[PDB]
């Protein structure tokens, strides 16, 4: 019989529905005066209220924008906009799905070995760098691709450092002509340009040092910890692809020109676009490889020649992750890789609400790939392409704010698609609009009348 | 603790010189004890790095010490239709020091030498050269024996045969017993790798101040070979002396070649007419296995034993991880004409790049105990990176898992403490073993002095 609507004692319809979302207010002018007008709908109806005359609003949620998902504008999320209908205390609960449509940004940067050596292998590691623009670009529409060439530590006896011409032109002696020595350079910075991407590879031609081992591993580790040059984007997957036609120096082989300091796995490449510390630091180690590769979120690619094929795949194991393919005329093997690569790539739905109310608080029930219903949780993770996912939100108020129209945001991270939430608060009942002040009914007119009951 | 940690002697040279980057003890003719130091980055007369050698008294405050004063000149020389030429800059003067009776030997791995012949030349690269004091009598020798006249066309029809143009000629370097003069020549032979020896007395005796290019009679190069293995072996980055086949007439070598056969290393123990004897390969590549070699007798049972450092070697551990923390291997010769087998004891570094086996120095018999003892230098390992000697003791199965001692460095960061290492000398003459400790970073050099007990502090 009894319950809180009741006991309360509400002057009005208004002081009616703030007790509890439960409650409903009768206005029927036949209701007789023992009668109580707040209370439960059933109880209400059973003292013979009309149902015309009870206010009795409910809290819902219409979809307003319900555009389904994206297969092969883009749609990820569903619904986008929603209205939402609250009155004191309640909580409207309501659902939305989230599907990885779009294609991962993907960053390769290549590693070409310009040593005399390559002179040979020159055409193929120019189309091997087109090539893997190609095969990436029909894998994903968001790529960005840069270079950098390297030879070896520019001192002796590595290098060349007579007759006075063999500076300038280390091919001197053979009566060609051939590019001065550097250690590593950095060419083209990540960009989107592909074509002219193309035309710089094609651009690049061979230098000469004196001792087959060559100091890609320099080139390795300043490509991998010099972000702002390389210019790695941090949301982006990493592909650092290397070539070579022979063996590699190591660490404490510098000791040969007289360099024993460590490599301290900082950065040195800056204005010139030169790892300036290539004559007064050593070679990297396989284990400070590792560190920085693993730190900076890249997958090292060896793509050398078949002569240096098992080499590499014995270096690959000692440094996990690292995959190894055949640099030739043929481009398959490499490429291969490539596309290996990209279908590891895993992406993540991490809920984030912005522009909520103080007011309101929301709490998250989340259906990941395994279809399970955990609750409390707002991200899933070990999304491939295609993947969907499901949460369901509910949406609680604290009593009646009387800003009434306000809206926020629920987005996932990384995605430009969020779900828009219009809030209204409905605190007042259908009665109060035909309210009559100073009406002569209620103490001479003092007293203003709304929903059969004086003030 | 019986090396006191606490009562450290210091001795310094000019700041950049690296003070320290090798040394050895010297008895000066022949009762009192020095310490030879090499500066491989001292300036000379003109600012120019040429390097320098250091010849320490023994002092327990320490301090600077006197210059062991060399020729830092370039040479030029015409002899018939050729200009020989010798060039001494970066040259690393004090790269390696090594004492023997009454002579100190110096080298300098990186000093160029070329030869001109009308428009034709031999190209200017690092054939090394070592530099010989009596500091005594004040006599002077050289020993370069890798300079060449043969002009860059030769070669080139040749297919690169015989090449010494790049030996690095004394970037290691040991004496034996009977004074012959042992060269590590890393670059030789397009980057094999050679060892080139001569008898002391013959080296002085063969120079003339002036020549360049001349033959001691009685020296004994090592071979060129086309076996792939060997090809950027680096053979003889370092080396060393023992008795390996029971034949205490002739002596055996200790070669290392830590790039061998793609960069899986080995060591080689070969005889004095370079036919090796055993190999022992390298367990991980890139591991740098042979980077530092020692010979001593361990166990106790009058056969010299090896040890070889690993300083790159990385260590299994969870999740599949790889740590790299060096390692030093053991090697127990067995009685009778047995070949050595896989390693007695595998001792492991801790400190991440920490380079546990960079160098490896015997103590004698530390505690007199019966047993020779070793010390183990990681030269960027404890806790704080700072540097790290490890004092293992010997005992009959070989020697003890765990360290007795650890002597933790008192430079600071980048000091290279212990990079260099050298005992089993009474430099104080209490009549137990000393040990220095090089770090060459920090320009300086530790002396740590053995206790008449098995002490602590
Ligand atoms: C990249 O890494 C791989 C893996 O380590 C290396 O391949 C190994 O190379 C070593 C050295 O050549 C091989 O060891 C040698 O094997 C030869 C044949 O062994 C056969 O029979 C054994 C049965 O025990 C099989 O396990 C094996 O698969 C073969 O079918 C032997 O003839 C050799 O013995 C001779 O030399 C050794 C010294 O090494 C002496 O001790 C012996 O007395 C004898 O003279 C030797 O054991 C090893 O088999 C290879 N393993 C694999 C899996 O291929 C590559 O060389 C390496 N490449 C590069 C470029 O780095
Ligand atoms: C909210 O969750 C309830 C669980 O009782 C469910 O019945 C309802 O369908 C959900 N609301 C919407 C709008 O899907
Ligand atoms: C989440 O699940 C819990 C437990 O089943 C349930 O109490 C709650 O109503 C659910 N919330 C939503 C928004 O579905
Ligand atoms: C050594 O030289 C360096 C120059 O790089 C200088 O900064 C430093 O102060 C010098 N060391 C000492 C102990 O004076
Ligand atoms: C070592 As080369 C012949 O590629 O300059
Ligand atoms: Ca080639
Ligand atoms: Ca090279
Ligand atoms: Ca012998
Ligand atoms: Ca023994
Ligand atoms: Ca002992
Ligand atoms: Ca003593
Ligand atoms: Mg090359
Ligand atoms: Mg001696």
């Given amino acids: 019989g009894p319950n809180i609507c009741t006991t309360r004692g509400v002057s009005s319809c208004q002081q009616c529905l703030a007790v509890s979302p439960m409650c409903a207010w009768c206005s029927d002018e ?76 993907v960053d390769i940067y290549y590693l070409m070995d310009l040593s005399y050596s390559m002179k040979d292998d020159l055409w193929s590691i120019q189309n091997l760098g087109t090539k893997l623009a190609t095969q990436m670009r029909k894998l994903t529409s ?34 060609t002509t051939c590019l001065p020595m550097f250690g590593y350079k950095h060419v083209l910075t990540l960009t989107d340009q592909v074509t002219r991407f193309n035309e710089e590879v094609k651009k690049q031609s061979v230098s000469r040092n004196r001792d087959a081992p060559e100091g890609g591993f320099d080139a390795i580790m300043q490509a991998t910890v010099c972000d702002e040059k390389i210019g790695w984007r941090n949301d982006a997957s990493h592909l650092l692809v290397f070539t070579t036609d022979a063996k590699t120096h190591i660490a404490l082989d510098g000791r040969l020109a007289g360099i024993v300091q460590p490599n301290d796995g900082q950065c040195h490449v800056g204005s010139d676009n030169h790892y300036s510390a290539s004559t007064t630091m050593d070679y990297p180690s396989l284990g400070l490889m590792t560190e920085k590769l693993s730190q900076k979120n890249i997958n090292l690619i060896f793509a050398v020649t078949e002569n240096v094929v098992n080499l590499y795949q014995n270096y690959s194991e000692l440094i996990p992750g690292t995959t ?26 991490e809920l984030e609400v912005r522009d909520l109310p103080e007011e309101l608080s929301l709490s998250f029930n989340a259906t990941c790939l395994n279809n399970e219903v955990i609750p409390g949780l707002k991200s899933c993770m070990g999304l491939k ?66 929903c059969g009951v004086c003030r | 603790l019986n090396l006191d940690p606490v009562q450290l002697t210091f001795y310094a040279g000019p700041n950049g010189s690296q003070f320290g980057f090798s040394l050895d003890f010297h008895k000066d003719s ?87 012949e009308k428009t034709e030349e031999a190209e200017k690269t690092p054939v090394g050269s070592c530099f010989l004091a009596q500091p005594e009598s004040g006599r002077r020798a050289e020993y370069s024996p890798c300079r060449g006249n ?68 009685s020296q004994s190069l090592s071979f060129d070979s086309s076996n792939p293995e060997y090809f950027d072996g680096y053979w003889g980055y370092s080396v060393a002396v023992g008795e390996f086949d029971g034949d205490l007439n002739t002596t055996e070598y200790v070669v290392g070649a830590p790039t061998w056969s793609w960069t899986l ?113 990681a030269p960027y390992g404890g806790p704080s990176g700072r540097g790290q000697v490890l004092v293992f003791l010997g005992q ?62």
């Avoid at chain 1, 023992?34 to 809290?59: T, W, Y």
């Avoid at chain 1, 790529?143 to 006075?164: C, E």
């Avoid at chain 2, 040749?158 to 030996?167: E, G, I, P, V």
């Avoid at chain 2, 370097?173 to 050679?194: H, W």
């Fill in chain 1, 30 to 105: 036949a209701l007789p005066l023992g009668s109580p007008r707040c209370d439960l709908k059933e109880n209400l109806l059973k003292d013979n209220c009309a149902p015309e005359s009870i206010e009795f609003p409910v809290s819902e949620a219409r979809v307003l924008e319900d555009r389904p998902l994206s297969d092969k504008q883009v749609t990820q999320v569903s619904p986008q906009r929603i209205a939402l209908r609250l009155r004191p205390d309640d909580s409207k609960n309501f659902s939305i799905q989230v599907r990885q449509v779009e294609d991962y940004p």
């Fill in chain 2, 150 to 217: 043969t002009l860059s066309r030769i070669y080139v029809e040749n297919d690169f045969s015989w090449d010494k143009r790049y030996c690095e000629a004394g970037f290691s370097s040991v004496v034996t017993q009977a004074g012959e003069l042992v060269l590590g020549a890393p670059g030789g032979y397009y980057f094999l790798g050679l060892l080139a020896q001569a008898p002391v007395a013959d080296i002085f005796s063969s120079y003339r101040p002036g020549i360049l290019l001349w033959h001691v009679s």
């Fill in chain 2, 396 to 457: 009959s199965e070989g020697l003890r898992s765990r360290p007795s001692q650890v002597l933790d460095s008192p430079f600071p960061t980048g000091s290279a403490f212990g990079f260099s290492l050298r005992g089993a000398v009474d430099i104080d003459d209490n009549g137990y073993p000393d040990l220095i400790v090089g770090a060459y970073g920090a320009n300086q050099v530790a002396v740590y002095r053995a206790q008449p007990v098995v002490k602590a502090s």
């Fill in chain 2, 30 to 116: 022949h009762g009192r004890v020095a310490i030879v130091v090499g500066a491989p980055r001292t300036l000379g007369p003109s600012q120019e790095e040429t390097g320098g050698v250091f010849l320490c008294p023994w002092r327990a405050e320490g301090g600077q010490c006197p210059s062991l004063l060399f020729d830092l000149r370039d040479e030029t020389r015409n002899v018939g239709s050729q200009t020989l030429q010798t060039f001494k800059a970066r040259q690393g003067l004090g790269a390696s020091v090594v004492s023997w009776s009454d002579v100190i030997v110096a080298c300098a791995p990186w000093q160029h030498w070329n030869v001109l």
């Fill in chain 1, 142 to 175: 968001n790529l960005r691709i840069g270079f950098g060439a390297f030879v070896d530590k520019p001192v002796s006896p590595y290098m060349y450092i007579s007759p006075p011409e063999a500076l300038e032109n280390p091919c001197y002696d053979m009566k």
């Fill in chain 1, 324 to 349: 190894v393919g055949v640099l030739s005329m043929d481009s398959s093997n490499v490429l291969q890789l490539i596309v290996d690569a990209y279908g590891k790539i895993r992406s993540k739905v």
């Fill in chain 2, 265 to 377: 290393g080995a060591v080689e123990i070969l005889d004095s007419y370079y036919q090796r004897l055993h190999r022992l390969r390298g367990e991980q590549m890139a591991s740098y296995f042979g980077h530092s070699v020692a010979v001593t007798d361990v166990n106790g049972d009058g056969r010299h034993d090896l040890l070889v450092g690993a300083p790159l070697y990385m260590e299994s551990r969870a999740d599949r991880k790889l740590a790299e923390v060096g390692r030093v291997y053991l090697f127990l010769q067995p009685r009778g004409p047995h070949a050595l087998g896989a390693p007695s004891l595998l001792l492991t570094g801790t400190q991440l790049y920490g380079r546990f086996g960079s160098a490896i120095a015997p103590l004698g018999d530390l505690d007199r105990d019966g047993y020779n003892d070793i010390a183990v230098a």
């Fill in chain 1, 385 to 450: 392409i295609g993947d969907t996912v499901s949460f369901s939100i509910e949406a609680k108020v604290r009593g009646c704010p009387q800003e009434k129209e306000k809206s926020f945001t629920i987005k996932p991270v990384g995605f430009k698609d969020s779900l828009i939430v219009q809030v209204t608060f409905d605190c007042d009942c259908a009665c109060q609009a035909q309210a009559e002040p100073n009406s002569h009914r209620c103490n001479n007119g003092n007293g203003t009348f709304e």
